[model samples]
Target: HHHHHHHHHSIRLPAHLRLQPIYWSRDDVAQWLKWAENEFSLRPIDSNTFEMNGKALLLLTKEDFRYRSPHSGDELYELLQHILLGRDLLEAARAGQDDEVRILMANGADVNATDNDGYTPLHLAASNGHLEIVEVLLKNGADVNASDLTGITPLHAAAATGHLEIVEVLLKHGADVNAYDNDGHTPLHLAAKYGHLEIVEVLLKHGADVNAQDKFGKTAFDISIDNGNEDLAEILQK
Candidate 1:
């Protein structure tokens, strides 16, 4: 056995590290997440806008749900059919099922669709180093610069997950290396946070902003120090 410590869960683990409890394997996490997504509809819409009778429409003038869920929240479901299409497309893209993504796009899915948590399919694919899926998404017109509700872009995801190939692909497609997340952290912030040396190098080579801070005023170096990866901090110094 080996000794290890965990960061305070500020961000999800890199795809490669998510299943350490099992075997440090990608296939395990993929199977688990796939099963998990199905169990949760991920819709949470408000009902006032969801109440759609002729009388309600007369009062509201249009559907205006605050959230949308696929289950009991069916009240708000009608207002979010199009949004769900986008979610499905992104999920398909992340799954690397090119055919499924294509079908969804063909059926009018939004290429830039974001989830309730504000992550786009590009963000998911990029974070996990899903290079082929990223290419497929870009080829189908997915936005390289689309920010999540939290302002995190796919580039940030790629860096956070230490997916070097994905970083290159994103940069080639015009991703902003210095793009900030809701917390104002850049791709370099993520790379340092996770001790991903190669990813950090890619970001630096591509012009990532080294001195950027998050909303809380912490820099990437701060995150590295907090994460206790002295080696990574040393790498940053170099």
Candidate 2:
């Protein structure tokens, strides 16, 4: 009873999103999407790219970045078996269960594995504010500069969330202070836009190029003002 109870409850798939037959083939991926939606609810009205937030947008984008094989569904299924462990590890990572993650890794989990969205465990851990988990992943050699298909790094996630501990660990691990995504937005851009002044300062101290512009040619200062983050704007101006 205990084992069954634990396994059933171990998976934290959101109560809202129904995982149907189609989702079973990608069950782990579905759970991740649900977690993102649940986690980013705080960002409603912040970004229009999502109904509530960019949660759905980010998770759905996973499909676009999934790994492909020359063989048919059978080969893909086999590949998914391995990737499932990676997803499980990510779940542990986002939950801040470092011991669980360590066990999975010892059992042959891939610490550097990318989800369907091209995000590694570090990316999810950073975005979700799992500081200790992020540190554990880093100590196990998770890439500090790993990016999603959008080219957004863990630093970008931590900056957006104002995760000071995650930010510190990533910086210590040598995350590029000036790294940019496909949109060309640096971590500083995320910090300013998200009102993370402390993160902004940390990035600046680490040599983040404040003047760096995104594809739209907007710098962190520009985003700070545009996003109505006055405090961040003031901090950046200083």
Candidate 3:
């Protein structure tokens, strides 16, 4: 009798009453896109090209939320995912997270996704010496010569940071040995400026234009001399 008394009449709740709010932030949307990467493979038609599975795009669109009540859980999730996908992938690449990068690529994370500063994942990975992550990105069709909005390529980043292995990898992949950045400074100019002797030699071996000048008409040799890098200047002179 006590148990029966405790079990009072229960009223059934409607579906709307069971609605739970979706806590979807930019970060969450990025995580969701990472999940989506495993479901599709990103194909790069060109360095700046960003493409995705048509079906996947439709499923991820915020417009799909119209089928549900405005401000509902379904509507909010779609809107958040749309807002955060591209930005999230760039962050993953910048951090050298190979696993995260791979997943994002599968789901359509553009290998060439440039931030406001025009820096791509390739630039970030090479600059940070994330060799494995760089290779993964390259294998997936990252453009070795793809430049930032400022024309800074992965080779420039590698040379700037004196990332020997990365420099070698970029060269092997056919990175423009003479490619210049926005200021007209090539990888050789950067290596010389930073006194990266080994990098300078590698650039020379790859046929870098040692006499190439920047906007100021300063060559790698001039930069080495200006920086008092006599040893590098000697090599550049030859």
Candidate 4:
């Protein structure tokens, strides 16, 4: 019916245009993709990632593109696992499930694997204050100072969240105390901007450059002063 087709078309609108963009689960997206291929003779560039009529199509979930369903005895399973394991590891690290992370690593998951946004398991763990999991990951060969696409290291994530112990653990593992993110903010700048006084102290004690300037040429002292963090500003001033 015309009404039914219109409703369907509305559901497929881009997220920016629609009030509520329809979310097809991985399975639903896969089915719809297959149907589109057979019905329109469209060819996909690959599973999950798709292309149509010489243009790219958005085939992933809006929420970080986290979906992979492997069929039994499928030849693609092996290839897919290499890609999927990193995402799975990110989730497990965020959940603070050390056991799941260990199992995934044992099965040969890359400890430094990153998502499309370049967030590794260590970033997730540090951001969530999972100190134990952070230790486990570092022990399993995770890079202590791995930066994301935005140049954000685990130290930045930990500092922003006020995780003193996690920040300490990262520092102990040789995380760059003065690492700068794409926003030209260091861990100290983030700690000050977010009002995380204790984290600021931890970084400073660990030899973080109090006078370190970001790409914007703003020091942590300037960030603390601008953000109205008097105590942190005073500490950095000294």
Task: Please say which candidate is ahead in lDDT: 1 or 3.
Answer: 3
How many backbone clashes does every candidate have?
Answer: 9, 0, 1, 0
lDDT of 3: 0.66
Report the Cα lDDT for residue 157, model 2: 89
Ranking by lDDT: 2, 4, 3, 1
Runs off by more than 4 Å, candidate 3: 1-63, 66-83
Give the Cα error of residue 147 in candidate 1, in Å. Answer: 1.2
lDDT of 3 by residue, 157-224 (tens): 89999899999998998788888777888899899888899999998999987778899989988998
**All models, RMSD in angstroms:** 13.8, 15.1, 18.8, 12.5
Q: Rate the local accuracy (lDDT) of all candidates.
A: 0.64, 0.68, 0.66, 0.68
Error of 4 at 169 (Å): 1.0
Candidate 3 differs from the real structure by a C-alpha RMSD in angstroms, to one decimal, of 18.8
Tens digits of lDDT, candidate 1, 1-238 = 0111111211222344232222523343344333333444444323332333333322332223223233433332332344347657767877778778778878877666665555677777787667877887898787787766567778878888878888898899888787766567788988898889888878888887778878788887788899998877776777
Ten residues in sequence with the least summed lDDT for candidate 3: 1-10
Residue-wise C-alpha lDDT for candidate 4, range 10-34, written one tens digit per residue: 1121222211113334444445445
Please provide TM-scores, in order, for all candidate models, with all chains considered together: 0.62, 0.66, 0.67, 0.67
